[PDB]
Structures are given as structure tokens and as C-alpha cells.
UniProtKB/Swiss-Prot annotation:
Protein name in UniProt: SUMO-1 cysteine protease S273R
Species lineage: Viruses, Varidnaviria, Bamfordvirae, Nucleocytoviricota, Pokkesviricetes
Location in the cell: Host cytoplasm; Virion
EC top class, as a word: hydrolase
GO molecular function: cysteine-type endopeptidase activity
Gene3D superfamilies: Adenoviral Proteinase, Chain A
A Pfam family of this chain: Peptidase_C48
Species whose genome carries this gene: African swine fever virus (isolate Pig/Kenya/KEN-50/1950) (ASFV)
Induction: Expressed in the late phase of the viral replicative cycle.
Function in brief: Cysteine protease that plays several role during infection including processing of the structural polyprotein or inhibition of the host immune response. Catalyzes the maturation of the pp220 and pp62 polyprotein precursors into core-shell proteins. Plays a role in the disruption of host pyroptosis via specific cleavage of gasdermin D/GSDMD. In addition, strongly decreases the host cGAS-STING signaling by targeting IKBKE via its enzymatic activity. Also impairs host FOXJ1-mediated antiviral effect via degradation of FOXJ1.
GO terms of biological process kind: proteolysis; symbiont-mediated suppression of host innate immune response; viral protein processing
Keywords: Host cytoplasm, Host-virus interaction, Hydrolase, Inhibition of host innate immune response by virus, Late protein, Protease, Thiol protease, Viral immunoevasion, Virion
Record: residues binding substrate: Q220
Similarity annotation: Belongs to the peptidase C63 family.
UniProt-listed SUPFAM superfamilies: Cysteine proteinases
Amino acid sequence: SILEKITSSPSECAEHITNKDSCLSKKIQKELTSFLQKKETLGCDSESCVITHPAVKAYAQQKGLDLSKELETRFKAPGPRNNTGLLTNFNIDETLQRWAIKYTKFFNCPFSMMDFERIHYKFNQVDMVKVYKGEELQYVEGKAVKRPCNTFGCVLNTDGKHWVAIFVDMRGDCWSIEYFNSAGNSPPGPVIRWMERVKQQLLKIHHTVKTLAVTNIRHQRSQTECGPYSLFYIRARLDNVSYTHFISTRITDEEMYKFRTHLFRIA
């Protein structure tokens, strides 16, 4: 649960592209070598800044190239990388969507509110057996995709806009349904019933299924890191970091400030 124990990095390249230097494709890289080799003229320190400079966008588009496609892919989603701004619904969906690209068996459920028992949300409509069997729809790279998933992840709002994480591990011999709250508060009734419904569903295809509330420690003392805490839990659990770390040791908000540089590209 320390920032160096997971696979992310402060790089702005998308997590799935294993490119040594540039996040750009080979065609775009040499097509824009004139602007890439002199970033500090356009007023840029990064590649996402260059291919978003209106003049570079003019050249490559009057040359047929698609720099917007090069920005949606190959790059992490834009967001509060270097500030304590609250994470929007798009900061979270676009994060789990990009995490469905590298992590080929992860289910990126769209963000849900706490009203899912009375309002339709994909979170309350999924069937975890269909998720495991590969019969539920998830949005990866833009297309609708049905694929077998051994992991399930979602981030909900407990209503200001406070984010909490849901992670379902169906990989090992013990299947766990987890609720994480950085504020250390117990899950409300609906989530408390949702996890129990997923337990009975998963007991159809596996003999051991347990529900757990990772709500022991008040990790968050700041007012802004609800998002980074929730996204960090899913990413750490995806990298096989045990939930017992989040149960026993406090992760400071300063590590969540630092984790924001792993999440976004300024835009």
C-alpha cells in the first residue's frame, strides 16, 4: 500500500503501452519530430502538451494525422494530477476503463451512487456469475466488451462527494467481496445488502466466498483524497496487494497526493 509496491508510475503514458520513452505511436513520433525535439517553444514539458498545442494540432490535422485518437489512447486520462481537486465521475470511469486495457480480466463497473436500490445503476444490475463467465457488458477502449473477468471493481459515492471502493477478487481459491472506505466508516445498508447478494451469487460457482469491510482505519484526514484512495485500493488489489495491509497500516493522504501523478495527465 506504499506507492512503490504497485506497478504504476508518475509517467503520463497509458498503463498498457509498454514503450521505453514516448507514449506516441511510431508514425506520430517521427511525423512530429520537429515539435517534439523543442517542447519549450510551444510552452510544453510533456508530449500530451505538444499534441494539444493548437498549432501542432493544425499541422498534423492538415497532414491527415489523428492526434485526438493518439490522446484518448496511449495516454492516461486528464485530471487533477498536481492539485487536490476533487475527482469527478469522469476521472474515475476513464481510470477504470484504461485499467481494463492492461488488466485483461478486470471488470470496470461504471461509478454508482448510493441510491442504486431505487435508481437504475449498472452496479446493482450486474450478476457476478455473468461477470465471471464473461456475459456482462463493460466498456474497454470505447467498445462494448463481454469477457471473462476474475476481478470486479467499482467506486461509489456515499450520498458531499465522498468516494468509496468496491473490489471483488475471484482469482485465488478464496473469493473475497471487499468494501473499502478511507474515512473508516461502515458501508451503508444498500451496499451491505449488495455484497450479500454477490456472496450468494458467487457461491454458485465456488465453494468459498467471503464478504469483508475494509473500514478499520481512518486513513484519510484530508478533505480531497476520497477519489485517489478509492482508485488506489482497486489498483493495489489488482496488483495482488492483500487487503490486510489496508486493514492494519494507515496510508497517509500525502501518499495519495503523490498517487495523483500516477493517475492523470494535466489537461
